[PDB]
Amino acid sequence: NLYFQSMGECSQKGPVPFSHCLPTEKLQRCEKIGEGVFGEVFQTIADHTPVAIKIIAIEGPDLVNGSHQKTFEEILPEIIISKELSLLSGEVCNRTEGFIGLNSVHCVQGSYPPLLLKAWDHYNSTKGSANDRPDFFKDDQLFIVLEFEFGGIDLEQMRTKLSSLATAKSILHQLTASLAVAEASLRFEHRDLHWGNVLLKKTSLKKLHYTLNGKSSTIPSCGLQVSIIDYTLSRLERDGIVVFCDVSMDEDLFTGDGDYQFDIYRLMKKENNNRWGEYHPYSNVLWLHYLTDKMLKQMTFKTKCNTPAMKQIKRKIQEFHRTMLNFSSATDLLCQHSLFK
Ligand SMILES: CN1CCCN(C)C(=O)COc2cc(ccc2OCC(=O)NC2CCCC2)Nc2ncnc3[nH]cc(c23)C1
Ligand code: NA
Ligand SMILES: [Zn+2]
Known part of the structure; x- marks a missing residue:
């Protein structure tokens, strides 16, 4: 594990624990806001400001939500696209804030946090989910965890x-x-x-x-x-x-x-x-x-x-x-x- 986190804008090298991305207070305030075959999206608060956290299992051999997990090489193109679009907010000749802002990207290793399972359950009970409850991941599981600016509804x-x-x-x-x-x-x-x-x-x-x-x-x-x-x-x-x-x-x-x-x-x-x-x-x-x-x-x-x-x-x-x-x-x-x- 000799890569830098968040495209070289985080000083950690190799996978990080969920707690790196979701320290206890941020983790406790997570509420689920949506989903897809890819995994799960939660809203939480960082420095008094809402953010969205999208969590995608990668690199494992078994099915998640009925589909194989992507490899990192398979997901990388979309990470690149997300970042390029976000970077348009700081450009000069062609500038727009109209794409979702990407704050950070991490590769995380571990089992799914029980506090996120609680939030998943609450969404399942109120809105209903098409997804598997994400409680079957083992301590070797890798994820890509993306933090976006909160975009609304x-x-x-x-x-x-x-x-x-x-x-x-x-x-x-x-x-x-x-x-x-x-x-x-x-x-x-x-x-x-x-x-x-x-x-x-x-x-x-x-x-x-x-x-x-x-x-x-x-x-x-x-x-x-x-x-x-x-x-x-x-x-x-x-x-x-x-x-x-x-x-x-x-x-x-x-x-x-x-x-x-x-x-x-x-x-x-x-x-x-x-x-x-x-x-x-x-x-x-x-x-x-x-x-x-x-x-x-x-x-x-x-x-x-x-x-x-x-x-x-x-x-x-x-x-x-x-x-x-x-x-x-x-x-x-x-x-x-x-x-x-
Ligand atoms: C819950 N959320 C709908 C969920 C289901 N759904 C339609 C998606 O997931 C679509 O794709 C994105 C969703 C969000 C952010 C970025 C997405 O795309 C880029 C991407 O993830 N790149 C990744 C790069 C690597 C792979 C994908 N979601 C949101 N972001 C911010 N605030 C939000 N409020 C409401 C929502 C939301 C809707
Ligand atoms: Na934006
Ligand atoms: Zn980091």
Whole structure:
């Protein structure tokens, strides 16, 4: 064990105990906030500030949540993507805070902490879990433990909670800007931006700031800051080296039904001729269209569009829905679409 922790930004070498990442008070305040086949996500408090902790078992031979554990080599591309996107908050020509911030990454060894099992149980009793109770791991088990800034609540879970379609406009504008900046900087495609992967949190900032190819602009917040998550299918590049998930031989991804989400996977494959290493930023437009579609058809707002000014916003979002598929990229949308003028 002769690697440094957290990409060289932690002085420990080799695996660390859970207690390195979750000292007793941080551990005691963990509450589970979500899950997937990968493992578990908890919210806790560090220095009076909420954070999210995502815990993924790696390198072992046996099944977790019905699937084999990834190796570190298998997970590394997504760690790289997460970090590159987070680093856009501190860049100059192409700058955005719209991707989830990555605080730290550790490789942890040990059995699962009993205090996290308690939090897992509470979630299972209240919301119900699709996962195995993570109490079967042995003292040799390795995990990747990622600490993200806390991003809030997902858009699907906020289906009935947003003020108005003005809020929807801000959300769409924030998403479009973040995707554009990542296109410009990293030739980035998200490739899986369903409404579970858009987070919303309160902000006291009235305007949010971004920079696209050296040009800075602002977006009225409507009191919310958007964060994009989930890079399972994402693609980007740096100095000509491409990191992407190769789904060219996957079958089931393209046979979904019952939501426009599942059409987007098929429409992506059409656009790229099943060649997933290429750059097709139209996929970002496809996802933004799916999101706009959710805003207009599945979201319900606390205040409807009662005045002609608000009815006009609604009409303009309907016009965005009808016209946006004729743009080539999130960059094209941001720079050219009337909605964002
Ligand atoms: C609980 N959480 C939904 C859980 C289920 N779900 C949809 C995911 O997991 C999607 O992916 C991410 C989720 C979060 C953060 C980063 C993710 O992606 C990058 C990544 O993990 N890279 C890793 C690099 C190596 C492998 C993956 N989750 C959150 N982060 C911050 N605040 C939050 N509030 C609400 C949530 C949340 C939603
Ligand atoms: Na962020
Ligand atoms: Zn550390």
